[PDB]
Amino acid sequence: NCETSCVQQPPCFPLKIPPNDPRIKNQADCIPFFRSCPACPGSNITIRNQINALTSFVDASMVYGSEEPLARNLRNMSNQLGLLAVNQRFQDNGRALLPFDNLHDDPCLLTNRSARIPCFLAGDTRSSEMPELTSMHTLLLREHNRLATELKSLNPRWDGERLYQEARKIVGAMVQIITYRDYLPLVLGPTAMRKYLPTYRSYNDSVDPRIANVFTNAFRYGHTLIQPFMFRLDNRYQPMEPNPRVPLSRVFFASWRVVLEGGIDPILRGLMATPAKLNRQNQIAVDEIRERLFEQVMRIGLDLPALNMQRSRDHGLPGYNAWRRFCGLPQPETVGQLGTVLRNLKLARKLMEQYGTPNNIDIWMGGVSEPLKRKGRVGPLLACIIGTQFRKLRDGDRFWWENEGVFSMQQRQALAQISLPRIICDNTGITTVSKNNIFMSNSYPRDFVNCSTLPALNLASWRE
């Protein structure tokens, strides 16, 4: 049992504890770790590889599911309205919450006994991991139902299946737009955006759209953005008393906070009007995730950065210089060379003391150590890996929103007007929201506008 034992026997690969650890004094203890399922269990032929349970495509599978029985179960099959199922016990000031899941060992119930609020059911199994994530899932559920409702008014003869599919297509396109127009340019910065995501031309059926094993580790750069609190703000964008800043180690799996502490509006305001954490070389990731990850629900607090490194080993990922080489970037061999690459000899020396050679630095560690690209939030190595993956997901998706045949020209024109602030206006009680770009805007009231200034999605071109 990898959760309760420190024995290293398959499928367990527990993290051992160093001497003088700041938290775990017993060196016979361990941080629990299950090896990722192998694609070919028990093989003496294959080189072990791991499995992606989801669709690689940017298709909102986190809302709809990636397997047919789950996808059916997420739908409201009581009627012909093409809706997703909503919570039958609770609403958030008259607006929909996600349905509850039925888990054997439900971790959300552990976070508050008296509340008895279980985990939510969504297209992905992680939707209750933090209330900020739950809030985004809930926002997309509402948006689906809003579109299906509007499409039924527009097209009264459409059946449930048609309504569901047309609203699903729109939600997928909105996720693609927000991601490629607004989010990625701010991850990569302008030079890397131009290099790895040049202007879209059309679908190329020879582009492999799979997620690469390395991207599952590299895209964890986002752990460096995480703040140690969940911030909740009222309708004046002021701290919502009496607990406006909850430590992250008391929000993991805390679905009760969404249901019984004010719904999604205060959380979404907190996200818009609070800065992200900046990744700096001596401020890489916070202790709420390095020391106290899932502390409420488990026998010991996990260390997310450490898990990332153990995971890259579990997955057999090459080290830092091999990935530099893959990307066409120079590979440092000495502490002096690594210091140049990092603009930081102190950090280079610390890395060499742990790893001996930059050949052996784990990909997450090396990737998050590099200085950030201009107007981006990753360095050159992570920019290459991330930018390369997202180009494949775009050019290799037959259902990419701009590909001819997916939407009409008029539907594409209407879709181009969407924004995440408008989606928030349409599906919540929030009336003042971030100015575009939402991912940059972070200070109230300077960067905020009223909802009435934002164009809403015009569905006229969906009338048949």
Added chain:
Amino acid sequence: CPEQDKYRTITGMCNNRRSPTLGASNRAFVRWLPAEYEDGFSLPYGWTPGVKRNGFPVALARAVSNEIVRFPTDQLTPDQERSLMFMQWGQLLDHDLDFTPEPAA
């Protein structure tokens, strides 16, 4: 695969008509570089006491975290040009792209 279709499948099957599992769920990841395991094919670096990687001892993941990642939370620098929504969209997006399953306890 249907020769015409209008909507995505739920599993992602049939997006690529020539290789119809590509991007579909419950399939192996693509490798951009060949894997590196202690025995070549299955055991991870750090599995076997005393086995070096490319000439050097393997650092404990928790030691690296302690020595390089750990910092005093009061030093946290807020990003003047990104919101926390920038973090949160990333996580939500990751959950559209990949989930790597593990065996139950």
